[PDB]
Amino acid sequence: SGFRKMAFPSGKVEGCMVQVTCGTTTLNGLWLDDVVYCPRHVICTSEDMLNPNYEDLLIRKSNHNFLVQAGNVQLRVIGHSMQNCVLKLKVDTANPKTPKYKFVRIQPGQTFSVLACYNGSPSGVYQCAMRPNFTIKGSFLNGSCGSVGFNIDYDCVSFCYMHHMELPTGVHAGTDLEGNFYGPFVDRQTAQAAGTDTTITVNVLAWLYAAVINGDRWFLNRFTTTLNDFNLVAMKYNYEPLTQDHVDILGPLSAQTGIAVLDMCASLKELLQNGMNGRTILGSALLEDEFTPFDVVRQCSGV
Amino acid sequence: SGFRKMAFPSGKVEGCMVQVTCGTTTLNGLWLDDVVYCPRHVICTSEDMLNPNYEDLLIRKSNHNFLVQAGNVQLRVIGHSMQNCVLKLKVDTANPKTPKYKFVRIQPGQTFSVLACYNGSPSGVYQCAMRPNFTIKGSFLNGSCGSVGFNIDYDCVSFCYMHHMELPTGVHAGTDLEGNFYGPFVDRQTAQAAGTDTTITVNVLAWLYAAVINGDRWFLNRFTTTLNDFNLVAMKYNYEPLTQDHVDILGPLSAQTGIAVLDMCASLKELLQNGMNGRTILGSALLEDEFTPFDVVRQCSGV
Numbered sequence: 082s083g084f085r086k087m088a089f090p091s092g093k094v095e096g097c098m099v100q101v102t103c104g105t106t107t108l109n110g111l112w113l114d115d116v117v118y119c120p121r122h123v124i125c126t127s128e129d130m131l132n133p134n135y136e137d138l139l140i141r142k143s144n145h146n147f148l149v150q151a152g153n154v155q156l157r158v159i160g161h162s163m164q165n166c167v168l169k170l171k172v173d174t175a176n177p178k179t180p181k182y183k184f185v186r187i188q189p190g191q192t193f194s195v196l197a198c199y200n201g202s203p204s205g206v207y208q209c210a211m212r213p214n215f216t217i218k219g220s221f222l223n224g225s226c227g228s229v230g231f232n233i234d235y236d237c238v239s240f241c242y243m244h245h246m247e248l249p250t251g252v253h254a255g256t257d258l259e260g261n262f263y264g265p266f267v268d269r270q271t272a273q274a275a276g277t278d279t280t281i282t283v284n285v286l287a288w289l290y291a292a293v294i295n296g297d298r299w300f301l302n303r304f305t306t307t308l309n310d311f312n313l314v315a316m317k318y319n320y321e322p323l324t325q326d327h328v329d330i331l332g333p334l335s336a337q338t339g340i341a342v343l344d345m346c347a348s349l350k351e352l353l354q355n356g357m358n359g360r361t362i363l364g365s366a367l368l369e370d371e372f373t374p375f376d377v378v379r380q381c382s383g384v
Numbered sequence: 385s386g387f388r389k390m391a392f393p394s395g396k397v398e399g400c401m402v403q404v405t406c407g408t409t410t411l412n413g414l415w416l417d418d419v420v421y422c423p424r425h426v427i428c429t430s431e432d433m434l435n436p437n438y439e440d441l442l443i444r445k446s447n448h449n450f451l452v453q454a455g456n457v458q459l460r461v462i463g464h465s466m467q468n469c470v471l472k473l474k475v476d477t478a479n480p481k482t483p484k485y486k487f488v489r490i491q492p493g494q495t496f497s498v499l500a501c502y503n504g505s506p507s508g509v510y511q512c513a514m515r516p517n518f519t520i521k522g523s524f525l526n527g528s529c530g531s532v533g534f535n536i537d538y539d540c541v542s543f544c545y546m547h548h549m550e551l552p553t554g555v556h557a558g559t560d561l562e563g564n565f566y567g568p569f570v571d572r573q574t575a576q577a578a579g580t581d582t583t584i585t586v587n588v589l590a591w592l593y594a595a596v597i598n599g600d601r602w603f604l605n606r607f608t609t610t611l612n613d614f615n616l617v618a619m620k621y622n623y624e625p626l627t628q629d630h631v632d633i634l635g636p637l638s639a640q641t642g643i644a645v646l647d648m649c650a651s652l653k654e655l656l657q658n659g660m661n662g663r664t665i666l667g668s669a670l671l672e673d674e675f676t677p678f679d680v681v682r683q684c685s686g687v
């Protein structure tokens with residue numbers, strides 16, 4: 082029993098983190114086979130940050146302008162190329178610690194683990210969700226760019242995020258490992274706003290099922306609701322519409338607890354309309370939306 | 385910027401996790417040099433759980449009653465002994481992945497990372513605090529015993545917790561790595577209650593400083609308070625007394641934000657007396673007490 086924001090074990094990714102320096106700029110890179118992946122803004126200087134032309138900065142660079150260090154072993158760069166907003170630095174050594182891996186792009190509402198790193202050295206690990214507005218609410222300081230986000234299935238690491246920047250609101254923005262940004266952000270020093278965010282409804286429901294599985298039942302009721310009448314309430318509270326596919330995805334959790342999905346919807350509607358009146362759910366006074374149904378099943382399987 | 389419940393990178397501990405089976409009971413062990421550490425209740429049977437006499441079960445055991453597996457490599461047990469509530473299984477192979485390590489016992493109010501494991505295989509990592517009543521609010525299922533809690537400084541893993549049991553309230557109890565329980569718990573299948581818990585005051589203050597460092601300032605005021613008048617309020621809300629040593633420990637955070645400790649105490653007093661009135665601090669509608677001052681400095685250093 083218990084329910085915690087749980088990250089994947091980070092060892093397999095720790096073995097892939099290197100330090101990449103260009104000029105006076107040092108950040109993190111991801112070393113897989115004989116390629117090191119890092120944010121392309123490592124080649125930028127303070128004088129070309131409003132609108133850097135990246136193919137230009139890059140054409141003016143050599144292999145010997147890139148210093149790659151794995152621990153305290155220097156890697157020789159033998160090739161460089163740009164892939165959207167990431168640099169691919171070919172090195173003369175394949176990483177002997179390369180795990181089986183995939184480059185996957187995730188969907189808003191999905192979760193992943195972030196291994197925060199500085200100077201190629203892992204600092205901490207925590208769980209993030211991709212917000213509906215394609216930002217993440219992370220914990221990143223200067224020097225953290227190139228830190229990655231990932232999921233693990235079996236023994237295969239699915240990389241899904243590389244960190245590039247922080248917005249004025251304090252949330253974070255980055256790319257998939259093909260260098261394509263999540264959301265309408267660009268790797269340049271503005272002054273960029275995220276679109277309006279919303280609450281991930283299917284996740285809130287998943288977390289209520291986690292609560293029931295852990296013995297928190299006070300929010301349940303006899304009411305049921307139609308999917309239509311629920312989504313009418315959801316839209317008023319800035320919650321994403323709940324689809325039949327979300328209902329199907331919640332199937333196993335519904336079956337394990339004997340609470341129909343539309344019944345839990347009726348509990349959610351009351352919570353949205355009345356609040357909690359000073360009670361908590363799984364230790365929170367807020368409705369939590371950064372646990373997926375999979376996260377709940379993975380952590381609560383067999384009570 | 386940002387503030388997340390952050391665990392230490394788990395790689396160094398992942399390399400130490402093994403599977404230990406005795407009879408039909410399988411749980412996790414910690415393999416350091418040529419010793420495997422695990423909960424002694426691995427030698428118990430269903431018929432001897434109310435009051436197992438452990439020296440008895442142990443005298444009746446041989447080395448060949450213990451099957452130790454590291455991944456899919458079997459380790460030969462060449463010696464066994466009991467140290468309080470842990471078993472020490474001497475094996476014929478020193479773990480080549482042994483990190484530099486220490487066995488440290490922590491204090492209530494201190495935090496650590498837990499690597500949850502099943503069948504010797506790491507499942508997830510998350511951050512825990514030792515509660516004032518010597519329980520932890522973790523996430524543990526059947527098969528998780530022998531999972532460990534730890535901190536890292538530099539490259540040295542300080543192990544502080546091994547998991548043994550869950551209480552009826554859903555909180556968790558275990559030992560240090562010398563096998564000595566945290567709190568008044570025993571490794572037998574009762575029905576055991578924790579003493580009354582309290583809120584870790586110095587940590588709540590640390591987290592308010594984190595909030596200010598991250599731009600959440602709405603709870604600040606011009607009031608200051610005496611340490612005496614604050615502790616009068618704290619005792620009424622089940623908060624631990626704040627000592628001068630706690631005030632000194634908060635020194636660096638006070639200096640970084642320019643908010644005197646006793647000034648933040650005055651903010652805390654108002655929050656305890658009025659609540660938040662629907663506002664949040666660092667994304668929480670509750671006052672968070674599982675971040676130490678060190679946790680805050682480590683994550684917020686340089687804004």
Ligand SMILES: *C(=O)[C@H](C[C@@H]1CCNC1=O)NC(=O)[C@H](CC(C)C)NC(=O)/C=C/c1ccccc1
Nearest residue numbers: 221223224225226245246247249268269271272
């Ligand atoms: C990379 O390490 C760094 C990570 C930042 C630093 C602070 N928190 C983070 O996540 N990325 C950058 O510094 C990035 C560089 C660009 C050339 C892409 N710029 C930003 O993150 C912020 C730009 C900004 C923010 C707010 C107002 C105006 C500009």
Ligand SMILES: *C(=O)[C@H](C[C@@H]1CCNC1=O)NC(=O)[C@H](CC(C)C)NC(=O)/C=C/c1ccccc1
Nearest residue numbers: 524526527528529548549550552571572574575
């Ligand atoms: C070890 O893997 C296991 C972990 C439990 C299982 C469920 N959540 C956990 O943390 N430890 C035990 O099962 C332990 C065995 C004893 C012989 C020490 N017993 C318990 O955790 C619970 C005992 C209990 C709880 C509630 C009411 C009555 C008894």
